[PDB]
């Protein structure tokens, strides 16, 4: 969760609404196992 600690302070002339971009990654102790088929995709029938 992302909470406003103090506020977003802005002077005269600069715009009101800003934006934050979130970028996710993995560490050097990441490990995966038990290879499977992908879940979060489908496919329509009758290709071509």
């Amino acid at each position: 969760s992302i909470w406003y600690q103090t506020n977003y302070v802005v002077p005269i002339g600069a715009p009101n609404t800003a934006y934050i971009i979130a970028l996710a990654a993995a560490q050097k102790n990441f490990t995966m196992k038990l290879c499977k088929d992908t879940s979060h995709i489908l496919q329509t029938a009758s290709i071509q």
Binding site: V9, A25, M32
Partner: protein
């Protein structure tokens, strides 16, 4: 690092580019809430559109530490502070900072 679709509110095709960033603005100064998302990289959510959400869709189990790198794209003369809290499971959505 790859872009995490935290603001997965819009649906239509003319505004699908808005699902990469989430807005901040001026509040009443009560310690408000900006955004929340789960930290599961194998669930239908924000982690689905990363390189970690498609390469851990081809695996059943995973281990190790995740990390979420943010980036501010505002003005130079505008400052602010944010609290980015991580809740271990069991604890529901908090009602206050």
């Amino acid at each position: 690092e790859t872009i995490l679709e935290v603001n997965n509110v819009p649906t239509n095709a003319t505004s699908l580019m808005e699902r990469l960033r989430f807005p901040v603005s001026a509040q009443a100064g009560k310690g408000e809430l900006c955004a929340v998302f789960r930290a599961d990289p194998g669930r239908d959510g924000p982690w689905q559109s990363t390189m970690l959400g498609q390469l851990c869709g081809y695996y059943t189990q995973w281990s190790g530490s995740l990390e979420v790198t943010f980036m501010f794209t505002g003005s130079f003369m505008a400052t602010g502070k944010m609290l980015i809290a991580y809740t271990p499971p069991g604890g529901p959505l908090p009602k206050d900072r």
